[PDB]
Every structure is written in C-alpha cells, then in structure tokens.
With several copies, the nearest count.
Chain A
C-alpha cells in the first residue's frame, strides 16, 4: 500500500512540473512569436500562407441571409417575399425625388403605425377580404400621401401577417429598398456600403453615444437631432443616402440596439445585390492582391459572390480570421497559441 502511495505522489507532481514546463515553454514561444510579429513582411508572408490553406479546402453550400426574412415565422415569409418583389415591380416607375419622398412618406407612415398600435391591430387582423382594411388605411391617409405609397400600403395590409409590428417593419424594409434603389440609380452602391460599414465600426466601439441613440422614451427626432449633429460634423460621409437610411432607422429603432441595427442595414444593403458578406479580422491591412485571393477563394468556398470587411487589430498577432453567416475559420496566430496552450498533456 505504501509502495503504491509514494509512487502516486511521484506521479502527481512529476505531472505538475511536466505541465508547468509545457506552459512556460509555450508562452516563451509566444515571446518568440512576438519578435517574429514585429515586421510587416512576414505578417503578410503568413497571411499568404493562410490564404493558400483556404485555397485548399472548398466547398460548402451556404445559404444567403434574407435579413428580416430569417426572423420570420411562416405566413409572414410569404407576405414579405411577394410584397418586396412587388416593390421590385413598383420601383421601376419612379425618379429621384419620387422615391426619396416615398421614404419621407413611408417612414412617418411607420412612425404613426408604431405609436398607435391599436389600429395597427385592426389593419393586422388576417381576416380574408382586405377591402375593409384597405378602406381603413386609405380613408386614413389618402389625402396625406402620393399614390404609390398608399398603393403598396394596400398591398401591404392585404397580405396576412404572423405578428403585429411585423407589418411596420415590412413597410420599413420597403422604405430601405426604395432608398437603396435610388442609390443604385445614382451608381453609388459600393460607396454606400463602405460608408455604412465604416460607420458601423465608428459607432459600436463608441457605445456611450451608441446607447444615447437608444433611449426610445425620448421623442424620436431627438436622437437623429443629435445624429445629424455628429454626422455632418464633417461631411466626408460624402453621401446623403447613408444619412437618410440611418435617419429612418434612428426614426423607428423601437428599442433595438443601434450597434447591431446599423450593421443589419449594411447587410440588407449588400444582400439587395445578392452577395453574402464576410467579416475578417487581421493584424495589419492587406494588399488588393490579398483582397483578390480572399474574395476569390471564399467566393469559391461559399459558392456565392462575396464582399469582405476588415477589423484590424494587432492583438490577433498575424494570420486571419473570417466569419460568414454564423460559422468561422480562424487562422490567427493568437488562437493557435491559445490552442497550443490549451492542449498541454
């Protein structure tokens, strides 16, 4: 028994010092990883390596995110689908201030519909003949608006919905659709996306003012009142469409988080073109040769055309990490160091 016991204690701390040397040696390896992380040449001379390992691993049949449709339950998916492509029909017929005023119209249409939920209920009840409800909404706001709006508003409450506010954000979906179709007419669809994404980065890591644009108990204009204050603080936010978009969501936030709301809108922006968005972390900015290979291969993998976003952070210590949909490919040396540490015998 004693012969067993003192051997057990031998085994115990021999294991102790085993793992101790392991850990201190691996963080010494981290110390070495740093003097190798210093220069830029090898930083990109390892991102190339990562992108090759990506060159080797395709494919997967990922789905496209219909941003609000994924939040839907059945019988709202149908309504939203065919209404948004009905608006795809409608948007052909207009001009510039046509749909900018379709925004101006529809956004306060949503404002009212939100603040008086009582008649929202009645125009939401999915009884069959819409005619009483189309009469309701037009009798309300015919002399308020231009024809196309109450047109597709009839089209809106015509279809049945699974919830109540589902319809107000359906009409805000079509609001966005309108404004981005205008930005498309202006040929400004890449710049609007880069503005929106950079402004995302601008906002969420500054949450103290991000939460400020969150007190719904404040009268709504109040928030955008501040918002324009900061935005045209300088207007190298060189586009006004971006101002209108984020203005309209600041108009109807309804307690949602701005930090994720604005990127939700960046993603409906990129999805309108039909391309999945991928978010990438790195240690230093990349070439457009690296961008070419990145967009090229990840498009090969996900079997769909893609665009990329960057969040440079030295703390990831070289390599790359990509996030698409909800899956991840991490090749950053930081995560690999953490793994080597976490798998010690």
Chain B
C-alpha cells in the first residue's frame, strides 16, 4: 500500500518510513496500533519533522508502551480535528476530541482542524472596556479588560487555581455567552472538582471542558490548548457571541514543548527551553484574541518556575497580555489572599482616560504608599520602627492597613477558611481606599482590615475588636 512503518521508538517520539511520494504533510495525524492485550490501543502520532530519505519524525499523543518496530502506520491525510458547534457545550473532551462523560458523542458534528492561522492584522482592534469582577485589589490596581487578555502569574501553589475558580464564579455565572475551559497539563482531581462544581452551579450547560492532564504524554499537553482554542475560535467566528476562554496553566504548553525538543533533535536554548519558545508561544497566543466585533475574554493561569519572574517562559508570556495579576509567595507567606503583588501587577486600562481620574489617583497613591513601605521594611527590621520619621511612621501604619485591606474573602475560598465570600463594587473600593490613603482609619487596628469586604464589614469587624471607624 502507501502506509508507513515504525522505525524508531524513543519515548514519546516515533519515526516512521513511508514509500516515496507518500510522505504525509507536516502536522498530519497518523494512526498506529498497539496490540498487546492489556495495553491495546490506537496511537495518534502528529508529524513533527521531515527527516529525509522518506523518514518522518512524529510525536505520539498516547503512551508508546507496547509499540513494535515495523508495525503499519496509517496516514489520515489531515491534521488533528476536534468537534465544533453548539453541541460541545456541557461536555468534557480529550485533547483529541473524544467525549469523556459520554464516549461516542460528537462523532457526527462538524470537525475543525486544531491548526489555524491567527486573525489578520486588519481585523485587530484594541479593547479598552473594563470588566468589573468584585475583588478589591483586582478592580483597583489591575482592572480587567472585557474582550481582552488576562493572566494570573504565579509560582507553585500561591493562588492561581483558586483565583481562576473565583473568576469562573464571578464573570461566568451570570455571563451572556459561551465559556470554554482548557485545563492544560493540570491535576485530574482539580478537573473533576471543576466538572462537579460547574454541574451544581448550572454553569456546565454553557461550558465546554477540554482536559489534558499531567499524566498525559507531552503531545497531549502540547495540543490540548489548541483543541480548546479551536472550539473557542469556532464560537467566535461562526456563532459570534461573547466567548470566555479560561486556560489553567498555559505554561504546561511550553513545558511539554520543551520536554520533546531534544528528542526532536534541537539544540537547547538558555534555560533548557526549546529554541522555538517565543515563536511557538506567539503562534498559540495570537489566536487567543478578539477581532473587530467578535469578542473573546481570555484568562490564563501562568506558572512561574521557582518563583522566578525572569524565567524565559513567563518573561515571554508577559508580552501577550492586557492585564497581568502577579501573585507572590512573599504575600502568600503573610496570609494575605488573594496573594497579589500590588507593585508588580499591571493593566493597560489603568489610564486616566479609561477608568476615570479618581480611580487612577487612588490607585497611584496606594502604589506609592506600598512602594515606600517596601523601601522602609528592611530599616524597620534592623533598626526598629522608632528610628523612622513621624511622616514615615504614619506612612507605615497606613501601608500595613492598606496591604491588609487589599486581601478579601473570596467565594472560592470557603473551603479553606469556612467563611463565605463577599463582593465589593468598584466605587465602594475607590471610596474606601481613598479614605485609607487619606488616613481616616488610622485608629482601627491592623486586623479588622484582614479578609473582609467593603466598608460596612470593616465597621462590623472593628466593633468586634473594640474600635469605631
């Protein structure tokens, strides 16, 4: 025939040989068979490279344990395709488009390739409309853009998953469109938790979940983001209504790309990443976008390796975002939640013309106070607080109360504290922090600012501690 033959199997990378004139195009999906009775399955290999002399280097999307040299490889003649349409809402899918809670569902839908080009430059338009969440620190210092790109940068286990569940609860529960969740290389326990949580919150009927977890080979973790992104792109281009796109740990995409890079025969770059780090990240991220008239509010959790924000992967992801909420382990260690670093977090719509001048002035004063406090902290640690000015002692008191008032009891944290969460409008946040920076609460203790909502809860917890306001 014109089918191939396995030649080399070194982990998740498989070389295949085809007859002359029957070499499959790049990114095609090939089928091979594993016949060992306990591990019998069908391998899907994605063509990665043309090696020459009719050899073709591919990446398997399933574990190759049990694969034999010389077995037949069938060329499907097209890339990996996933189902698309209004029928994927309410279901869980593989990285390959196989429904998980109902195997065989979606076999008859329209199928779309998971490899597409980003929208052309003429359809791109800046988005500068604020998306109000209800969190104090987010609404004040990093206002989210509606139809723009948002990220939660964080080290290992700071707040990323809890905050992204909080944003699913806040933005998506009363949302007038379609949500897509891509868990890219994350824990399966968390995936099941999110499935059940969306099922009980009646958000599942509007969501399409796509799961490729950490137990999967690097091919699945390379392509699951593309599968979910293809579903979202269908919802944006054809149906055209207000897509939300959550991506838990888009860093796993880059990590999986780096796990197979040398096996594909590429010299490694600086920190052991593939030489094609920035360009692969740009080919993926430029598709996660909103065109003129068609909106995709994107939100991605971004793992920061070893709490190092200079690592090439987060350093490259930084350039693709409109609002970045950067969580810190120095803030996690103090018990402040969400553990947002206010001096590193950013937004493009924190502008006098977009959010108004009062919002901007209050945010700038908060940031200035917190920066001065950070500058004083070491002097305070060594020489004691009594060696400062009275100007500076006043500033330090205000700054500690501000650092504590930025924390909040979130709805998705009731499992870690037992205390239900709260919502604070943006005007109440602006007024509250204006009063804080002016000094109206210098008498209330440091606590009673810790894990509360607006100003009335501040009053309640202050009287619970013996103070006015």
Contacts and interface: CB of A to CB of B under 8 A. Distances in A.
Contacts of A259: 20
A75 B1 contact: no
B403 interface: no
Interface string A204-218: 100110110000000
A120 interface: no
A73 B53 contact: yes
B17 A74 contact: yes
A257 interface: yes
A207 B2 CA distance: 9
B52 to A, nearest CB: 9
B21 interface: yes
Contacts of B55: 74
Contacts, number: 23
Contacts of A204: 20
A144 B183 CA distance: 72
Interface string A54-88: 00000000000000000001110010000000000
Nearest to A208: B19
Contacts of A211: 19
A75 B54 contact: yes
A257 B20 contact: yes
Interface in B17-49: 17, 19-21
B94 to A, nearest CB: 34
Interface string A104-120: 00000000000000000
Nearest to A211: B19
A73 B8 CA distance: 13
A75 B20 contact: yes
Most B Cβ at <10 Å: residue of A12, A78, A162, A207: A207
A211 B54 CA distance: 11
A257 B55 CA distance: 13
The bracket for how many chain A residues form the interface is 10 to 19
Contacts of B17: 74
A211 B55 CA distance: 14
A12 B20 CA distance: 43
A162 B20 contact: no
Interface residues of B, number: 9
Interface string B365-384: 00000000000000000000
Interface in B155-210: none
Nearest to A255: B53
A207 B20 CA distance: 7
B53 A207 contact: no
Interface in A161-195: 162
A256 to B, nearest CB: 10
A236 B53 CA distance: 33
Interface string B47-71: 0000001110000000000000000
B1 A208 contact: yes
B21 A207 contact: yes
Interface in A233-269: 257, 259
Contacts of B53: 73-75, 162, 257
B20 to A, nearest CB: 5
Interface string B298-331: 0000000000000000000000000000000000
Most B Cβ at <10 Å: residue of A12, A74, A210, A259: A74
Contacts of A75: 20, 53-54
Contacts of A162: 53
A78 B21 CA distance: 13
A161 to B, nearest CB: 11
Interface string B102-130: 00000000000000000000100000000
A204 B19 CA distance: 10
Interface string A255-295: 00101000000000000000000000000000000000000
A266 B310 CA distance: 61
Contacts of A207: 19-21
A149 B79 CA distance: 50
A101 B43 CA distance: 53
A41 B20 CA distance: 36
B293 to A, nearest CB: 13
Interface in B237-282: none
Contacts of B21: 207
A73 B53 CA distance: 7
A211 B18 CA distance: 10
B43 to A, nearest CB: 22
B20 A74 contact: yes
Most A Cβ at <10 Å: residue of B17, B19, B20, B55: B20
Contacts of A78: 20
A78 B53 CA distance: 12
A207 B53 CA distance: 14
B1 A74 contact: no
B327 to A, nearest CB: 41
Contacts of A73: 53
A12 B123 CA distance: 12
Interface string A122-137: 0000000000000000
Contact of B54 (A12, A74, A208): A74
Nearest to B21: A207
A259 B20 CA distance: 9
A302 B48 CA distance: 39
A12 B121 CA distance: 13
A266 B54 CA distance: 23
Interface of B: 1, 17, 19-21, 53-55, 122
Given A74-B53, A75-B54, A257-B53, 14 more contacts: A12-B122, A73-B53, A74-B17, A74-B20, A74-B54, A74-B55, A75-B20, A75-B53, A78-B20, A162-B53, A207-B20, A208-B1, A211-B19, A257-B20
16 contacts: A12-B122, A73-B53, A74-B17, A74-B20, A74-B53, A74-B54, A75-B20, A75-B53, A75-B54, A78-B20, A162-B53, A207-B20, A208-B1, A210-B20, A211-B19, A257-B53
5 closest A-B pairs by beta carbon, nearest first, are A207-B19, A74-B54, A74-B53, A73-B53, A207-B20
